[PDB]
Amino acid sequence: HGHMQTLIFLDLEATGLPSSRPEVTELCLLAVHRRALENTSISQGHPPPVPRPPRVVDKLSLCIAPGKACSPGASEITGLSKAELEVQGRQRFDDNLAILLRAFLQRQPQPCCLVAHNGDRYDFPLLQTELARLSTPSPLDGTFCVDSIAALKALEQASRKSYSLGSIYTRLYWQAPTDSHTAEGDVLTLLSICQWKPQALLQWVDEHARPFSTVKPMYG
Amino acid sequence: TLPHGHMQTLIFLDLEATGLPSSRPEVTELCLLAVHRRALENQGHPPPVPRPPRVVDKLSLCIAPGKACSPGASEITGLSKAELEVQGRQRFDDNLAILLRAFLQRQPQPCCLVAHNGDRYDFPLLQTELARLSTPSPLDGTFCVDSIAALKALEQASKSYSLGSIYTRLYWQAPTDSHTAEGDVLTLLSICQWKPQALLQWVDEHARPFSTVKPMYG
Ligand SMILES: Nc1ncnc2c1ncn2[C@H]1C[C@H](O)[C@@H](COP(=O)(O)O)O1
Ligand SMILES: Nc1ncnc2c1ncn2[C@H]1C[C@H](O)[C@@H](COP(=O)(O)O)O1
């Protein structure tokens, strides 16, 4: 493949941890063209200012009704619960959602790469499982993906620590992240850390991006 | 009165575009923020800015127009045809319509679009963009109302009705970041959360079919 033209930052909130065979409760996508990223001002200072998000971005944030209740742990940090989602008429992960996801992705210049923090262990496998439950073919069969933990790890060692979203943000900017544990809030925080070294991050992504189709489902 | 029953979903909308009506403008940015009726159920002088509901669906998209933006437009919206192309944004197309259609499908009916000055700007303009597509309009079953009339009505109960003017008057605070589709949509949500029940009742009473909105130009 060539250079990724669009980076789609992703975060999912769910009913719980992998062992519980969790289901998605919230999903946020933030598509950013590589030009927007390489155009972000280089960070200067220690700590440097938090990068300014690009003006031109595409965003999607959706709350989804899970097939089962959230565990006390997931609900307390995400602020979501099956009862509230359902009473508010949220629908399950279905064909229409897949259609919506495909259309959102098609608005972006290809090739495109999904970027998620701990995505290789959580987000990508979970999304794969959710899509596998549907009848239609996956809309991500032409999309690439990459875990931002590995990326930042490389970027930091090139410039043992916790590589959690908030820990990295705090390490780099000496500032506290906002709206943690909400799909949009975490996506916005991820965007900021990936904007730390724009050029280096883009290059690393280009070198490590892999087909989402190769992602193994979290559970069958 | 409920000419169309109680609205179960209010979709706050705002469009940024190339220019003013007489320019046969094209949309450059679009944002939809769908809130369930239950969510709107959320004394100070002035009161604090209402917190937005936790559960919400949001869509914000940038769009490349067929022509350049007027300096005045580009200056306040921060968008320009050149940059939108550099960022590889696509024109208003059928895929966009399909996206809106699927987004709307996720919301419980009936749904009512809410836009500040929507009756004169957003709705007519939206109708025009969709009308010229191959895909039939995905909003023919959706309702709409202008928040300007609504806030005038609510304020009647105890001069400038621009989005920014109303927000400040009510909260003695400046809106987060105006002239950006999402920024203006969130500000609109806030002013509509001023008097929730009253706003909801007013919307239920004045909602009309978006299908009856006449396009801005052909
Ligand atoms: N402690 C605990 N209990 C149960 N479920 C959890 C916990 N920590 C994370 N998660 C699950 C539920 C979250 O929505 C999701 C992503 O976390 P995020 O990091 O915000 O993207 O991971
Ligand atoms: N001064 C001026 N010149 C050209 N075009 C303009 C101007 N003011 C508004 N507009 C057009 C372009 C904006 O994106 C749109 C909606 O503004 P909104 O704020 O959301 O109502 O109206």
Ligand SMILES: [Mn+2]
């Ligand atoms: Mn996450």
Ligand SMILES: [Mn+2]
């Ligand atoms: Mn999260």
Ligand SMILES: [Mn+2]
């Ligand atoms: Mn407007």
Ligand SMILES: [Mn+2]
């Ligand atoms: Mn606006």
